Homo-oligomer: A and B are copies of this chain.
């Protein structure tokens, strides 16, 4: 009975970071309390000034990652401020019943509600908005994120030996469907409501206009590139609430990967490219062995390089000539 347990309150942080948390823990079950506030807003999604009439949990695409341990209870307060135009809700794939919670969290502008569910299954799980009659529209306009339910004794390899990460990043991949006018330029809308009909027509073609990580082309590059060091193990959580994607780390590997994202299954090792099913989140570990700027991307290279699904990881430390060496630099073909 959950009414007996202690409560904790967690303060969420914005992607790509994930809020501090323990992996293996001595602590017993708790009710973990979270709050998120919906923000509808217009966002610029590319380097030519294209806009999206977006919908977000807590102002970001994706929404923040919530982290609990298996056996915990998640207690979410969801707030839809009066500054918004649309009703919203939440479906947690990690939850059991009532369409993931959607049936109990229908909130019109100016309202709020509070849901509890048992996080009884370990893994990374998508959450998303699911208003009746307009589910795909809210999802593809940005209303999704990840719940990570860690096993109480931390992650394990196929032989039951312990695994860990020194640092975690969360990547949400968003297939966008931005309409164009008769002139061939993307339309800019005044309100969310006025984008709907043209957007549905684009959706039905199944061809995204843009595919972005974390809300925009180049979100995870330059000053916003991800960071690590030789010797550090990173966990890359990758969510795609609507469409398949195939994550790859260029110059690296997936050392241990749960592509279906469920920690009670053995992970696979040495992956070049893994597969996130639309409607799921997965997770990969990698320990950096070389310094440099890596790219992390969807390995449909058109989706990555033309449509936007790629970021950078900047890695510090010493080059290792045993792993890789330039034996002869580019030079003329001998006469």
Contacts and interface: CB of A to CB of B under 8 A. Distances in A.
A207 interface: yes
Contacts of A186: none
A306 B104 contact: no
Q: How many copies does the complex hold?
A: 3
Contacts of A104: 324, 326, 329
A332 B300 contact: no
Contact of A299 (B125, B262, B277, B319): B277
A123 B270 CA distance: 8
Contacts of A320: 97
A156 interface: no
A75 B327 CA distance: 8
A154 to B, nearest CB: 17
A107 to B, nearest CB: 5
Contact of A112 (B275, B299, B333): B333
A314 interface: no
A97 to B, nearest CB: 3
A216 interface: no
B97 A324 contact: yes
B270 A262 contact: yes
Interface size class of A (residues with CB under 8 A): 35 or more
Given A104-B326, A136-B302, A301-B242, A262 B269 contact: yes
A91 B273 CA distance: 14
A324 B113 contact: no
B270 A122 contact: yes
A278 interface: yes
Interface in A316-335: 319-320, 322-333
A163 interface: no
A264 B269 contact: yes
Contact of A110 (B118, B246, B251, B332): B332
Contacts of A250: 91, 99-100, 102, 130
A139 interface: yes
A34 interface: no
A136 B207 contact: no
Given A121-B253, A268-B262, A269-B262, A330 B111 contact: yes
Contacts of A273: 93, 260, 277-280
A117 interface: yes
A174 interface: no
Interface stretch (A10-18, A51-59, A197-205): A197-205
A44 interface: no
Given A91-B250, A99-B295, A273-B279, 7 more contacts: A82-B333, A93-B248, A97-B290, A121-B270, A248-B279, A260-B273, A272-B279
5 contacts: A1-B322, A2-B325, A111-B330, A206-B303, A273-B278
Interface of A: 1-2, 75, 77, 79, 81-82, 91, 93-108, 110-118, 120-123, 125-126, 130, 135-136, 139-140, 200, 203-207, 241-244, 246, 248, 250-253, 260-262, 264-265, 268-275, 277-281, 289-290, 292, 294-295, 299-307, 319-320, 322-333
